[PDB]
Design a protein around this nucleic acid. Sequence first.
RNA 1: ACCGAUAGUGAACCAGUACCGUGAGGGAAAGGUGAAAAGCACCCCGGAAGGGGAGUGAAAUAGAACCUGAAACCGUGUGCUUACAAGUAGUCAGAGCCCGUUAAUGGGUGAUGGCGUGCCUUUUGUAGAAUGAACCGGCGAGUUACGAUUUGAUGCAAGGUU
RNA 2: UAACUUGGGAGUCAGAACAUGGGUGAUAAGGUCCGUGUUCGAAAGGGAAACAGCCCAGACCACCAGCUAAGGUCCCAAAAU
RNA 3: GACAAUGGUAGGAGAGCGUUCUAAGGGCGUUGAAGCAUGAUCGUAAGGACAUGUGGAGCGCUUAGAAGUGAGAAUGCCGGUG
Lengths: 45, 102, 116, 145, 49, 112, 150
Amino acid sequence: AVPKRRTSKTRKNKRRTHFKISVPGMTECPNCGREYKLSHRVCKN
Amino acid sequence: MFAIIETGGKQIKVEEGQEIFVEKLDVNEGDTFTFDKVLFVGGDSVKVGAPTVEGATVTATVNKQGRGKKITVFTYKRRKNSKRKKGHRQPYTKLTIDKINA
Amino acid sequence: PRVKGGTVTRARRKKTIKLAKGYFGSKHTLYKVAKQQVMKSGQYAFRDRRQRKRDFRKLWITRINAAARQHEMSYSRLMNGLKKAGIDINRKMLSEIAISDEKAFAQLVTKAKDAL
Amino acid sequence: MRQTFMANESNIERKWYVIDAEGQTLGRLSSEVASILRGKNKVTYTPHVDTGDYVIVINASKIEFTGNKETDKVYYRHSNHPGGIKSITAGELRRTNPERLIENSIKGMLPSTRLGEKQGKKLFVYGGAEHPHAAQQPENYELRG
Amino acid sequence: MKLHELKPAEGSRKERNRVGRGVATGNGKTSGRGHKGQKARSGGGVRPG
Amino acid sequence: MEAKAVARTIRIAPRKVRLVLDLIRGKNAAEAIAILKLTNKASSPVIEKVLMSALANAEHNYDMNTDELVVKEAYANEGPTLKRFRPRAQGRASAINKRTSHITIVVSDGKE
Amino acid sequence: NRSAVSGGGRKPWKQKGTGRARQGTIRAPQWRGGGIVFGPTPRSYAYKMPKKMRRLALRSALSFKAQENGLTVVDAFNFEAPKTKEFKNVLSTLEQPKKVLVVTENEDVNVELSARNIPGVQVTTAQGLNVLDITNADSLVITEAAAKKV
RNA sequence: ACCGAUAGUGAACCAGUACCGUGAGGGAAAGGUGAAAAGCACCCCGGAAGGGGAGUGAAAUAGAACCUGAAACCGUGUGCUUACAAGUAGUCAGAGCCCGUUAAUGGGUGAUGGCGUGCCUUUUGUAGAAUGAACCGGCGAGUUACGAUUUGAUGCAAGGUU
RNA sequence: UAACUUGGGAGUCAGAACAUGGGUGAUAAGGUCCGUGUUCGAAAGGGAAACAGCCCAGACCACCAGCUAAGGUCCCAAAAU
RNA sequence: GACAAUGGUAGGAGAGCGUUCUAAGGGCGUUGAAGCAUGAUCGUAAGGACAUGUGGAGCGCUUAGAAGUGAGAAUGCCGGUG
Ligand SMILES: [Mg+2]
Ligand SMILES: [Mg+2]
Ligand SMILES: [Mg+2]
Ligand SMILES: [Mg+2]
Ligand SMILES: [Mg+2]
Ligand SMILES: [Mg+2]
Ligand SMILES: [Mg+2]
Ligand SMILES: [Mg+2]
Ligand SMILES: [Mg+2]
Ligand SMILES: [Mg+2]
Ligand SMILES: [Mg+2]
Ligand SMILES: [Mg+2]
Ligand SMILES: [Mg+2]
Ligand SMILES: [Mg+2]
Ligand SMILES: [Mg+2]
Ligand SMILES: [Mg+2]
Ligand SMILES: [Mg+2]
Ligand SMILES: [Mg+2]
Ligand SMILES: [Mg+2]
Ligand SMILES: [Mg+2]
Ligand SMILES: [Mg+2]
Ligand SMILES: [Mg+2]
Ligand SMILES: [Mg+2]
Ligand SMILES: [Mg+2]
Ligand SMILES: [Mg+2]
Ligand SMILES: [Mg+2]
Ligand SMILES: [Mg+2]
Ligand SMILES: [Mg+2]
Ligand SMILES: [Mn+2]
Ligand SMILES: [Mn+2]
Ligand SMILES: [Mn+2]
Ligand SMILES: [Mn+2]
Ligand SMILES: [Mn+2]
Ligand SMILES: [Mn+2]
Ligand SMILES: [Mn+2]
Ligand SMILES: [Mn+2]
Ligand SMILES: [Mn+2]
Ligand SMILES: [Mn+2]
Ligand SMILES: [Mn+2]
Ligand SMILES: [Mn+2]
Ligand SMILES: [Mn+2]
Ligand SMILES: [Mn+2]
Ligand SMILES: [Mn+2]
Ligand SMILES: [Mn+2]
Ligand SMILES: [Mn+2]
Ligand SMILES: [Mn+2]
Ligand SMILES: [Mn+2]
Ligand SMILES: [Mn+2]
Ligand SMILES: [Mn+2]
Ligand SMILES: [Mn+2]
Ligand SMILES: [Mn+2]
Ligand SMILES: [Mn+2]
Ligand SMILES: [Mn+2]
Ligand SMILES: [Mn+2]
Ligand SMILES: [Mn+2]
Ligand SMILES: [Mn+2]
Ligand SMILES: [Mn+2]
Ligand SMILES: [Mn+2]
Ligand SMILES: [Mn+2]
Ligand SMILES: [Mn+2]
Ligand SMILES: [Mn+2]
Ligand SMILES: [Mn+2]
Ligand SMILES: [Mn+2]
Ligand SMILES: [Mn+2]
Ligand SMILES: [Mn+2]
Ligand SMILES: [Mn+2]
Ligand SMILES: [Mn+2]
Ligand SMILES: [Mn+2]
Ligand SMILES: [Mn+2]
Ligand SMILES: [Mn+2]
Ligand SMILES: [Mn+2]
Ligand SMILES: [Mn+2]
Ligand SMILES: [Mn+2]
Ligand SMILES: [Mn+2]
Ligand SMILES: [Mn+2]
Ligand SMILES: [Mn+2]
Ligand SMILES: [Mn+2]
Ligand SMILES: [Mn+2]
C-alpha cells in the first residue's frame, strides 16, 4: 500500500507536534558543581 | 437634510457637504454643477417629489474627474481552449455638495 | 541565431504567482497550481460581480418589507401604492430612509396608503 | 459599494420576548418565531451578523396539531450503528418533554450556517407557564396571524 | 530613405503565419483533428478508392 | 555586540540536531550547558562544543561578563549532502542520503 | 540533426514492461544532448532583380543625393596623404564617398579617414550611395555616370 | 545577421577516458576566486573539522565546494488569526485589530453571510471512479531547398526576361 | 434582406436527448433504423432540490439603478400567512 | 453627433505583444550595465516603465532586416529537491 496523495507541509507538521524530546529531570550536585540526572550518582567529585 | 438626487443611472442620497461620487459628468474640473432632479427632501419640513420635488435643486462643486482602479476581466471555458482577458477602468466624477434646495 | 529562454518565462510566471496572494500554501507558491486558482478566481469574480447586483437588491427589499410591516402594511402593497402615487423612488433609497429618518418613511407610507 | 447601511455588534440591540404557545398550531407558531430569531422583522437586518431578538416560548405543553398528527407524524433518528434507526417516536409524544418539540421544529426553520446555529440558541422553551428568565425582563409578544 | 528610416512598399510583405505557438493565435492542434493530420499526411497525391 | 559562533557541515541530519536545539533555545547559558551535557542524543556534544566556543569568544573578543549571557538564538540549516546507495533485492539499488548541517548559536547581554 | 549526432541506434529499453516512456534513441530531440529539429542549415540568401529595376534604384539614389546635396570637383593629386582631411576645406560632412572615374590608387589610399569611402564609378552601389550623407563625384566620373545610367 | 557550457564536437576540463559488456560494442558527467596569491601573520574555543576577532583586498555578505546566485525544498523571529467545526480552498459582502504607499475613492490580516465539484486530453456526454502530470528549473514539435499555383507589391509593356 | 458566379484557405463523414409521423423489438429499453422541429454538441445566465439534451432566455465592459420571462410569494429563501 | 452590431469548438480572416541576432541613426553606463529581488505603477490584452537593495560591465531607444522567437501536460530528456 502506498500514499495516494502527497502530504502537505501543514499536514506533516501537524503530525509532528508531539514529536519533541522532554528536557531531562536534573539536579545540582551538592557542593560539587556539575549537575546530574535525578536519582542518579553524584560522580567522582 | 437629504437629497435623493437622480444623478447617474441611479438615485443618490446626499447630505450637503459630503463628497459624493457619480458616473462622469464631463464638465471641467473646477466648475460648479447643479443637480436638477431632486426626488425627496428629508429633515424637518419634508417635500416628497412625485417624481421630482418641483424646482428643488442640489448644488455641488466638482472636485475630480478620475478613473477607478483597474479590474481585470478574465474568463474561460474548461476543456475548450478559450479565454478572454480585458482590463477595465470606469471613469468618475467626485464632487462635494453645498446647499441643498439651493 | 539560437534564441535562449531567459527572463521572460520567469517574469511571466512570477507575475502569476504574485497574483495569487491570500492563497493556501502551494496555491500561492507553485506556478501551475496558482495559475489554476487565479484563472478560476477570475471566473468567479466575473459572475460574482453580476450576482452582487441582486444580492443587494434583495437585502434592500427585505429592509423595506420590515419597515412596511411595522406600519401594518405588506411590502407588496407598499410598492404598489408608491407606484400609483407616482413616487418613483429607489429601493436602496427607500430603505436608507427607513433607517435614518422614521418620520419621513412614515410620511411616504401615508402617501402610499392614499391612492389605494 | 455606494452607500448601504450595515449593522454590527456596536450598533445593535436585541430585546427579550415571551410567547404563549397554547391554542397555537405547531408550524405556524414555529415559522413566526424563527423569523423573530433571525432579525427578519427589523429594518436594521443585515445577513452576516445575528441581529435577532431573544425568544421564550411558554406553555409548550399545550401546542396543538391538525389531522391525525398525534399518530402518523413519526419523528425518526439514527444512531450511526447498523439497524440503528432507533428513530421512531409519534409526534404525539409532546407529553414526553415537548420543549424539544418546539425547539426542533423552530430550529429546522433556521439556516444550517454556524451563524444560524448560534441564532437558534436564543430560543428557550418551557412546557410550563413560569420561566426562569425574568431579570432579562421579557416583554410579552402578540402572535400575528 | 536615409537607411535608418527605410520603409517597404505600402502593400508589400505580410507577416508569415506560425502555427503551434499558443491557443490565442488560433492554431494549437495546428490544423485538422484526429485523422491524417498525422505527419505523413498522404492523400496519395490525387485519388479516392 | 552580542556574540555568536557557527559549526559547518557537521554530519548529523538537520532534523536530528534540531531536537536537541529546541531545549537549549532561549535559555541561560549555564543551564543550557547543563541540559546539553545530560541530554543523551548524538547531537548534544557537538552543539555543546559550539555553545562553548560561542561563550568563549564572547569574552576573549567582546569582553562580556560570561555569567549574564543568554542563548539568544540557536538553529541548524541544511548543508550539502553526501549521496550514497544501498544494493537491494532483484539487483535494484536505492538512494541513501547522508545529510549534514550548519549549527549556529548566538549568546547575549542587554541591548547595549 | 539526429542522424548526425554521435551515437544512436540502440533502443534504450524494451517498449513495454518498464513503466517508462517509449524511447527510440538516446539522441532523439527531447533528450538532452539529442538532435536538433529544423535548425539552421547553409543556404544562399541572394536573389535576382530585373535589370531595369536596378538601374532605377541607382538613378533614384543619385538623384536623392542630388535633391539634398551631392557635389562635384576638379580632380586628383599625388602619392599618399592625410591631406584629404585638409581637402575638406571643401567642407564635406562626416560621411562621404569620393567618386573617381576609374581606380585612382592613391586617392584610394585616402582610406583610413574615419568614415570616407572612395570607389570608381563602374562600382557605385546603392548601399554606399545610401549611408552616404554627402557624395562627391568629380567630373569625368560624373559624365561617365551620366553616360551609363541614361 | 553560426554555438556560448543541458549550447557548440561524444569530448572548451590528461574522452573514446570513469563506467558497462566474454566479446563485437556502448559511452558519460565535469568550464569561471582576484587586477594582482596579495590564498587570512597573530590571539582565541576545538583532538580535528569548523568558527569569532585581528588583518590582505575596491569588494571575502569575492575565503577556495570561491562571479552573479532564481525556483522547488529546509529553517528562526513575529503582526493579524485559529481548538462547536463538513472545506476543489477561491470569489462577492463585511466588522474588528495592525500599518502608512510608485497618495489613490491606500496596504496586511479576516469573526461572520452569499456563491462555488482543478487543469489537459478525449468524447454524444467527464467533478469524473476515463488519460496525463510528485514539485521546481532548464531543454523539448510546420522548417529549409527546389519546383507548381494563387494573391499582394514593383518595373517595364506587344512585349517581358536572362 | 439577402441570393448566385468564379477563385485562395478550410474543418466535418462516432453524434445526443426531447417532441412528433413511422419501421424493427414485445404499442420492452437511457434500444434500434428513417421523416420533421428544437436544444446540446460549440451556450454562460434564470427555473426544474442536485441534474449536457427539459422550460424561460442568447453574457462587449463597469453600476450597491429600473421593468419583466419561465417559475414563484408561512420559515430555510426574494416576494400574498 | 445620433444609430447598429460584438456567446462560441474544428476552422478561415485581421491587428498586435515580447525574445535573440543584424543594419543605420541617436543614446545610457564604475557618479554602477545586464541579471536577481521587493513595491500600493501604467496600457483594452500580450506586455511597458519608475524607485530602492543586490550586483560588478556591459546595455537600451528609433526604423528596417532575419529567425534555433514564446511551454504546463508528450508513463517526454537531464538536473535539483520533496
Ligand atoms: Mg486569508
Ligand atoms: Mg491569467
Ligand atoms: Mg391536537
Ligand atoms: Mg499536419
Ligand atoms: Mg524500443
Ligand atoms: Mg591627394
Ligand atoms: Mg541572414
Ligand atoms: Mg552480453
Ligand atoms: Mg585549546
Ligand atoms: Mg588547542
Ligand atoms: Mg573581519
Ligand atoms: Mg572575513
Ligand atoms: Mg470587499
Ligand atoms: Mg466565505
Ligand atoms: Mg500583378
Ligand atoms: Mg505588373
Ligand atoms: Mg417513435
Ligand atoms: Mg420506435
Ligand atoms: Mg431527428
Ligand atoms: Mg444554463
Ligand atoms: Mg454545459
Ligand atoms: Mg440557502
Ligand atoms: Mg525590452
Ligand atoms: Mg535605464
Ligand atoms: Mg549600490
Ligand atoms: Mg518587478
Ligand atoms: Mg522585423
Ligand atoms: Mg513533464
Ligand atoms: Mn514544529
Ligand atoms: Mn524554455
Ligand atoms: Mn450541511
Ligand atoms: Mn499574423
Ligand atoms: Mn479556433
Ligand atoms: Mn490529439
Ligand atoms: Mn481529418
Ligand atoms: Mn514519420
Ligand atoms: Mn496514387
Ligand atoms: Mn545479484
Ligand atoms: Mn547513426
Ligand atoms: Mn510510475
Ligand atoms: Mn549536440
Ligand atoms: Mn548568443
Ligand atoms: Mn557538452
Ligand atoms: Mn551557466
Ligand atoms: Mn583568473
Ligand atoms: Mn583554522
Ligand atoms: Mn581593507
Ligand atoms: Mn554550490
Ligand atoms: Mn557565489
Ligand atoms: Mn470557537
Ligand atoms: Mn454535503
Ligand atoms: Mn456551498
Ligand atoms: Mn495546450
Ligand atoms: Mn482523473
Ligand atoms: Mn487512452
Ligand atoms: Mn499519475
Ligand atoms: Mn458518407
Ligand atoms: Mn455516421
Ligand atoms: Mn425509445
Ligand atoms: Mn439512443
Ligand atoms: Mn412534413
Ligand atoms: Mn466534438
Ligand atoms: Mn444552457
Ligand atoms: Mn445555436
Ligand atoms: Mn441551469
Ligand atoms: Mn428532478
Ligand atoms: Mn440551481
Ligand atoms: Mn406569470
Ligand atoms: Mn421572505
Ligand atoms: Mn466573438
Ligand atoms: Mn450577444
Ligand atoms: Mn490564419
Ligand atoms: Mn563608489
Ligand atoms: Mn543580452
Ligand atoms: Mn537607456
Ligand atoms: Mn524553441
Ligand atoms: Mn517540467
Ligand atoms: Mn528527475
